[PDB]
Swiss-Prot record:
Membrane topology per record: Lipid-anchor
Name used for this protein in its record: Ras-related protein M-Ras
Span covered, complete protein: 9 to 178 of 208
Cysteines joined through disulfide linkages: none
Record note on quaternary structure: Component of the SHOC2-MRAS-PP1c (SMP) holophosphatase complex consisting of SHOC2, GTP-bound M-Ras/MRAS and the catalytic subunit of protein phosphatase 1 (either PPP1CA, PPP1CB or PPP1CC). Interacts (active GTP-bound form) with both SHOC2 and PP1c (all isoforms) to form a tertiary complex; SHOC2 and PP1c preferably bind M-Ras/MRAS, but they also bind K-Ras/KRAS, N-Ras/NRAS and H-Ras/HRAS. Interacts with RGL3. Interacts (active GTP-bound form preferentially) with RGS14.
Cofactor annotation: Mg(2+)
Gene: Mras
Organism: Mus musculus (Mouse)
Length: 170
């Protein structure tokens, strides 16, 4: 058998939940104080839709100019999660920056990605509606998913699996 690696890159503004989502996925715990500047990668064999793969995931953090790993992951990544927080309108607006960046680096008209609206467990603080998120995803022609990394987590496994599905379906 030829077991593929899917290199997945988690991008988005600071504070949106990239680390919490990634740690929830790999460790099944909610970490609420993960250093905003620390970048980690994760590697594991896992089975998605009854097909084995290796996932190599970068949880991006801090400045690109100080990152050892960023350049290679951006250039060679197979898919991207673009994460915003529904409580941070600027983070939602900035999705367009990440969308443009990915298409520029990958040098293609489209590329595997999912729009991830995180922190949907929060009601009072929510500033970006579901419909605003879904319309943005429609504009980019990419999937839209709502998540919460807080216990009990919502759609965390599904988000990573769905990105693999997009890669497989392209
Ligand atoms: N309520 C809630 N808080 C979250 C969620 N995801 C992350 N957080 C919190 O938001 C803050 C930033 O999360 P973090 O994962 O470090 O963001 P990052 O900078 O994108 O890596 C932390 O205090 C987390 O506990 C979520 O789904 N719901
Ligand atoms: Mg982080």
């Amino acid at each position: 058998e030829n077991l593929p690696t899917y290199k997945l890159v988690v991008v988005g503004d600071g504070g949106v939940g990239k680390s919490a989502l990634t740690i929830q996925f790999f460790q099944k715990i909610f970490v609420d104080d993960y250093d905003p500047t620390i970048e980690d990668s994760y590697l594991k064999h896992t089975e998605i839709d009854n097909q084995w793969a290796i996932l190599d995931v970068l949880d991006t953090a801090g400045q690109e100019e100080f990152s050892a790993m960023r350049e290679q992951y951006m250039r060679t990544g197979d898919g991207f999660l673009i994460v915003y927080s529904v409580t941070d309108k600027a983070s939602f607006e900035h999705v367009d920056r990440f969308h443009q960046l990915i298409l520029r680096v990958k040098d293609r008209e489209s590329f595997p990605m999912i729009l991830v609206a995180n922190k949907v467990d929060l009601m009072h603080l929510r500033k970006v509606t579901r419909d605003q998120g879904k319309e943005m995803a429609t504009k980019y022609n990419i999937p839209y998913i709502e998540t919460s990394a807080k216990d009990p987590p919502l759609n965390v496994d599904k988000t990573f699996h769905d990105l693999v599905r997009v890669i497989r379906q392209q």
